[PDB]
Design a protein around this ligand. Structure first.
Ligand code: ZN
Ligand code: ZN
Lengths: 377, 377
């Protein structure tokens, strides 16, 4: 049977939480979804088949890093990110705009930005048009509109002007995407809501995005230093402003309890480097909270990282042996921790989906928090 | 202080057993000595610094395999085996003659042998003169005379003729070695006693070798299928025939109890692939006998491979975690087992040396056998 470009179906709801599917030409994405951050398929990283076996339906590509090395045109000549990452299922790319704020910047205006590569100092340009074109060259299935991030905390004036520029750039992203037939017929485009902590600015942003029209809507400007309390407060009024029948995407979030609370507030999609960064640093996520595998307590602990996790690592490896690998600096140790962490995240999402489907998600969320924060690991 | 070409000193004796040192220009060899079989310094093998840290004072090079790949001239152009194996301490090379019997053979005569490479079918030639020259090109510190092996079991006639040819070839090895000033002044040459299980042939051989004169004397024709009982019986009368004040070398032996009994019979030097072959196959040597680390009993065994071994593996790794590595096919598992096995062999030799020095070696040998064969692992 033929597969659609982008079809979001909601199968069940509990309060603001939703569970369902996004059907795309390269596969189905179960929601709520967690997207691990992808990298080149080399001996340095988990194999793509390993990432898929953790349960991931889609992975994320960082446009900014790919355009500095090896470059978007080079990626295209190699067959796009799907070949480059050895991943034939959907790929979401960010716009590159956040990293130019956080990692580089030679010129800024309504036109776009010019920035210096922190690698070789070379100059690069991004704009709604260039960002959408680069994401096309990467073979992206879900394209993010290019917006303006204002650093945290933002004044009411800075938040107002960045949101308004972002909305003008959202229309430009829309038109650039629509102008490219191969991209418009085969990929999807998400808009990004801005407005910082100000409800009227968030509503303005949401109204603008809905008038332009997108396949999905992200909540931007959070997870940038504000803390969970205020992030939840902003989600409380911001997510209901977005179109109900399209996916809602909270970018760069986050810790497991962040994810649970955001789903309670209507978020459908997530990404975070946390599982990978933690895995390389010897920290494992468990249902009893995170653990530091280097701790002496684990040196003779024959139980797996998490006794309820069904990832391939926990079927086989004890805390004691992962402890030994990590303490010796063996790369296998980091690989096992990273595989478990990504798989744990997918099992979290699966438990979220199942509990919403059964109408017991609010109880799952309470059960989850009580145990995650008690830390009886 | 300047170092001698070859100086064997006996420090202490108990019965036929001796302990002491061989001083050579590239270092001191403690005796009785075990020589692991060396290979090229690549990611496939233990690093040379690891092999040294196990206690090895000297390693063995298989001339036959090195002459098929990459070839003796190629080894020389790379700086000899010391550069090729990353090992700056003494290296003993065999003559290549045993492997032409056991692994290849297009022509055989009193002149030498011509054989077909089991790799690429190419033709090669060995002779006392060519073998000594190749071992020179390899940078060998201890050179083995080229002899004729007769397969086991040998008729009294075949044993007689092979021994006599070997003695004529021993003189030719001696003269070839002596003809090359750079080799004669910096390396040593061992002769090889033959005669199978026949006492008069062994005496004939020993007399011939002593008349030629060598720096050391090997007992050949054992560990080829005969079993330990008969090997010990042959050693009982064969080793006393050799010059007392030169090292005695039992080639290709062997299991730990073989080594102990051979030292009781006057052997000073040993080599065997057993520690490495076992390590790759998941078998570890211990004071309670060998263990198969794949056995289910080890999956939760937090004790090291051997609780009295002081190798770097046993300081750190449990049976349970080596078990997990081996069962997963992780190369680290084989590396750890091989390091422990070679280190265990060196600790065996150290206990042999110390017990002889203290005049308690015969008691050590009895204690060792009772525990090794009870197998309370
Ligand atoms: Zn797991
Ligand atoms: Zn050990």
């Amino acid at each position: 049977t033929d597969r659609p470009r982008f079809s979001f179906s909601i199968a069940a709801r509990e309060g603001k939480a939703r569970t369902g599917t996004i059907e795309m030409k390269r596969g189905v994405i179960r929601t709520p979804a967690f997207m691990p951050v992808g990298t080149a398929a080399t001996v340095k990283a988990l194999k793509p088949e390993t990432v898929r076996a953790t349960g991931a339906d889609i992975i994320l590509g960082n446009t900014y890093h790919l355009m500095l090395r090896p470059g978007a045109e080079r990626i295209a000549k190699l067959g796009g990110l799907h070949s480059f990452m050895g991943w034939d299922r959907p790929i979401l790319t960010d716009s590159g705009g956040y990293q130019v704020m956080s990692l580089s910047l030679t010129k800024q205006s309504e036109e776009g930005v010019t920035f210096k590569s922190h690698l070789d100092g070379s100059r690069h340009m991004l704009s709604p048009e260039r960002s959408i074109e680069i994401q096309h060259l990467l073979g992206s299935d879900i394209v993010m509109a290019f917006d303006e991030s204002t650093p945290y905390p933002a004044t009411p004036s800075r938040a107002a002007s960045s949101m308004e520029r972002s909305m003008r750039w959202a229309k430009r992203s829309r038109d650039a995407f629509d102008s490219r037939k191969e991209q418009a017929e085969n990929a999807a485009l998400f808009g990004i809501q801005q407005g910082s902590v100000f409800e009227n600015l968030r509503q303005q942003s949401a109204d603008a995005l809905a008038e332009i029209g997108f396949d999905g809507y992200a909540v931007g400007g959070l997870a940038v230093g504000e803390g969970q309390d205020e992030m939840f407060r902003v989600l409380d009024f911001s997510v209901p402003m977005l179109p109900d029948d399209k996916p809602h995407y909270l970018m760069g979030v986050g810790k497991p309890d962040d994810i649970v609370g955001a789903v309670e507030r209507g978020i459908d999609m997530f990404d975070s480097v946390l599982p990978t960064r933690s895995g390389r640093n010897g920290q494992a996520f468990t249902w009893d909270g995170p653990i530091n595998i280097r701790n002496a307590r684990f040196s003779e602990d024959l139980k797996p990282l998490d006794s309820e996790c069904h990832c391939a690592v926990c079927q086989k490896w004890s805390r004691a042996c992962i402890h030994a690998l990590i303490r010796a600096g063996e790369i296998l140790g980091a690989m096992l921790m990273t595989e478990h962490n990504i798989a744990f995240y997918q099992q979290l999402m699966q438990k979220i989906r199942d509990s919403i489907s059964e109408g017991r998600f609010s109880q799952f969320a309470q059960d989850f928090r009580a145990r995650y924060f008690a830390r009886n690991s």
